């Protein structure tokens, strides 16, 4: 290796060898089918909105999110990078795909496939990602650095479906060699959203700009409609012309074919046809490719950008509705544009990369931090890209002021903006794309007073209940298999408007919003106020005993919802405190007397009742009525982790606080598997961990983070970070289960996981705070 010189991969970033099999791999725990993708996976494509691409560290373009909300995990072999090299003095040359498999059919059989393993490595710190690429049988030694600009404060190249591929090419050897890299891609229009004849009217065109001291040379991947539907659009990939190397391109290849069209003249000398041919396709899959050729001198290095682009303007849920995404704001809405995009991150790939090492050189240059949590603290953000994430510019056939935005839960529960989720893993976006995050805090606002009396079965009981009371705030903002923003609730396994913990949440969410972006927007408080007030107002009305508190109902009415609360919970009780003194504070902002009073004297009693009711000595009881109430549960004190955030100081005794943080680290954690796997959820007070359900028997990844935060504020650094550990370990160390770019919701004491790639674990930018 020789190439890594020559480059600048960060010390934090995710390794493994492009080819290496992964023997420990976890599973789903679950009884019904749920999403397992496999490990072969990489840090996304694409920005917030886009639709994003993952491509794989074995080189695959393989995990397509470009249908919004939808995962589809498949390999489509015609996209490559492939490299032709010839030593002078030599009779051939050789080539190969940069790609550690093969096709299963016969697609594409002239290709050299099969990337030899111990050639070469990946390398991951998202937004950037790499491959080094160091093989016996290819002298001239490559590298390529891979990234879209997903930069914080920046909500408009953040929007953009582009992705830069920055090569480096470095001759270590003593001759003259020759050397091509080419880009092919398949024209994907129809790869969904078309019910039949799903390659009818595919073509492709080239496009040569050429204007002094640039020159830009593109495949352009369409279809003849100019109809305007979810499927129809445009790919493109390109490369910019840099002193020494020459550009070629093959407009038109059969993709359903065995490629020795386009190989049988890479595989020559490195060079293609140059055959314009706009012929549409009928049946055949069809694909353009895109090549550099050089000769590098012994000793010389050069650097040369390819980029690919889709423009898809168009996103269509299950329920009817389609909407235009963020991007089209920036380069139009007809689907036509993707050279365009093609062309702005080729001219300013480098100022974007400046502008990424830039927001990560902060936390990089603190030598105080480990390694290990720059590597997962950069990465977990890869889900606010993969995440199905939903960012839109007006409904078609529609114009407002905002953009809605919405983040799944994960695609297994296909819920955008769970609640009571994202008080977990909204974190990223309020510290690093605030105007985001208040957005969505106004969605919820708008929410609170709608009224839906159609009812639905929920799924846990069989029981009918209404879709949406007045006063509640909602578990989700719609499923992507139905109608995002616009049908509330989409989520049905318990009925969310008799939930303890959303209305609470949603009120520390809106005051977190306005502390931890400076304590300045007044006018957000002020939109949000009304929501606040009554969603405590209806919370208070759940109190059956009078304790100044609501009572659990013996059910799961929480996030862990399939662990029965009953009385007055840690878990709930401890947010409901928290929540009041929001509201207080809030209340004296914005000069509302009464709210203070009334906010003020509930926190008060239920202050005081929750002290009485939970305190044991050692931490704070899991509740009051359970038959495992005395459960040390690694969430119960969730309320002041929120309020250490929120600066309004201690609802519990500092002493107290304390105690039950070292218990949890004590037996959640170190009784736990060694403390290697993070904070189980539910533990008895004998050492052995609560059986009552399967979630009290997980570790919650998001939770873990969370609670590492908690820690780490409360000057427990030793244990705040042992305890991340382990969730860094199972998720990206040779010892874990293989979960990176798809963190779980959770594992069990196997390793084995249920819901892959979700939201919570976002929570490890609470440690940032
Ligand atoms: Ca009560």
Not at 77 to 84: D, E, G, L, R
Not at 176 to 190: A, C, E, Y
Not at 237 to 261: E, H, L, R
Request: hydrophobic share 35%.
């Amino acid at each position: 290796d020789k190439i890594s010189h020559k480059i600048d991969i960060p010390d934090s970033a995710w390794t493994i060898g492009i080819g290496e099999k992964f023997k420990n791999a976890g599973h789903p725990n679950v009884k019904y089918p749920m999403i397992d993708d496999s490990y072969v996976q990489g840090a996304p494509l694409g920005g917030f909105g886009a639709g994003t691409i993952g491509r794989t560290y074995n080189g695959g373009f393989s995990r397509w999110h470009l249908e919004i909300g939808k995962n589809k995990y498949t390999t489509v072999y015609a996209n490559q990078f492939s490299v032709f090299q010839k030593v002078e003095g030599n009779k051939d040359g050789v080539a190969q795909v940069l790609y550690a498999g093969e096709p299963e059919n016969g697609y594409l059989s002239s290709w050299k496939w099969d990337y030899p393993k111990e050639s070469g490595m990946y390398y991951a710190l998202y937004p950037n990602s790499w491959y080094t690429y160091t093989n016996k049988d290819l002298p001239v030694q490559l590298a390529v650095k891979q990234f879209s600009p997903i930069i914080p404060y920046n909500y408009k190249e953040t929007s953009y479906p582009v992705a830069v591929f920055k090569w480096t090419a470095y001759n270590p050897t003593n001759k003259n060699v020759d050397v091509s890299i080419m880009f092919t891609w398949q024209n994907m229009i129809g790869f969904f959203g078309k019910q039949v004849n799903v390659n009818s009217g595919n073509f492709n065109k080239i496009i040569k700009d050429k204007s002094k001291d640039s020159e830009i040379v593109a495949a352009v991947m369409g279809n003849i409609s100019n109809d305007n539907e979810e499927w129809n659009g445009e790919y493109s990939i390109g490369v910019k012309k840099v002193p020494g190397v020459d550009i070629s391109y093959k407009a038109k290849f059969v993709t359903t074919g065995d490629g020795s069209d386009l190989w049988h003249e890479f595989s020559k000398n490195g060079i293609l046809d140059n055959k314009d041919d706009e012929t549409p396709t009928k049946q055949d899959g069809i694909g353009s490719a895109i090549a550099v050729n050089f000769k590098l001198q012994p000793g010389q290095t050069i650097e040369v950008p390819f980029a690919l682009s889709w423009d898809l303007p168009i996103m269509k849920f299950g329920g009817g509705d389609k909407w235009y995404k963020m991007y089209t704001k920036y380069f139009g809405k007809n689907g036509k544009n993707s050279f365009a995009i093609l062309k702005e991150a080729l001219n300013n790939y480098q100022k974007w990369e400046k502008m990424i090492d830039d927001w990560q050189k902060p936390i990089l240059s603190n030598k105080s931090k480990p390694d290990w949590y720059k590597t997962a603290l950069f990465n977990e953000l890869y889900y606010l890209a993969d995440g199905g994430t939903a960012w839109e510019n007006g409904k078609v056939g529609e114009k407002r002021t905002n953009n809605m935005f919405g983040l799944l839960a994960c695609f297994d529960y296909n819920y955008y903006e769970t609640l009571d989720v994202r008080f977990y893993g909204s974190f990223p976006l309020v510290m690093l794309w605030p105007d985001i995050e208040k957005q969505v805090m106004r969605q919820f606002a708008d929410t609170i007073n709608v009224q839906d009396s159609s009812e639905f079965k929920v799924g846990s009981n069989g029981a009918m209940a209404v879709k949406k009371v007045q006063g509640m705030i909602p578990h989700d903002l719609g499923s992507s298999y139905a109608l995002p923003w616009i049908k509330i609730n989409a989520y049905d396994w318990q009925n969310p408007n008799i939930w303890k913990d959303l209305n609470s949440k949603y009120v520390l969410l809106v005051y977190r919003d306005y502390v931890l972006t400076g304590k300045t927007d007044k006018e957000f408080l002020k939109y949000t106020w009304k929501s606040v007030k009554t969603a405590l107002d209806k919370l208070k009305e759940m109190d059956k005993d009078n304790d100044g508190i609501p009572d659990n109902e013996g059910i799961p009415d929480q996030t862990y919802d399939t662990w029965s609360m009953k009385g007055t919970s840690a878990y709930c009780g401890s947010l409901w405190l928290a929540a009041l003194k929001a509201a207080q504070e809030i209340g004296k902002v914005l000069k509302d007397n009464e709210a203070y009073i009334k906010y003020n004297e509930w926190y008060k009693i239920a202050q005081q009742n929750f002290e009485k009711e939970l305190w044991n000595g050692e931490y704070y009881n899991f509740d009051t009525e359970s038959d495992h109430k005395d459960s040390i549960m690694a969430d119960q004190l969730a309320g002041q982790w929120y309020a250490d955030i929120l600066r309004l100081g201690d609802i519990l005794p500092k002493d107290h606080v304390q105690k039950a943080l070292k218990k949890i680290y004590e037996f959640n954690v170190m009784k736990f598997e060694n403390g290697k796997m993070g904070a189980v959820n539910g533990m008895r007070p004998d050492g052995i961990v609560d059986e009552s359900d399967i979630q009290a028997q997980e570790v919650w990844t998001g939770v873990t983070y969370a609670l590492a935060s908690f820690m780490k504020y409360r000057g427990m650094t030793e244990e705040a970070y042992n305890t991340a550990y382990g969730v860094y370990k199972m998720t990206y160390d040779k010892s874990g289960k293989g979960y990176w770019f798809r963190t779980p919701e959770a594992w069990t004491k196997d390793g084995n996981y249920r819901a892959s790639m979700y939201m919570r674990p976002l929570s490890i930018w609470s440690m940032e705070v």
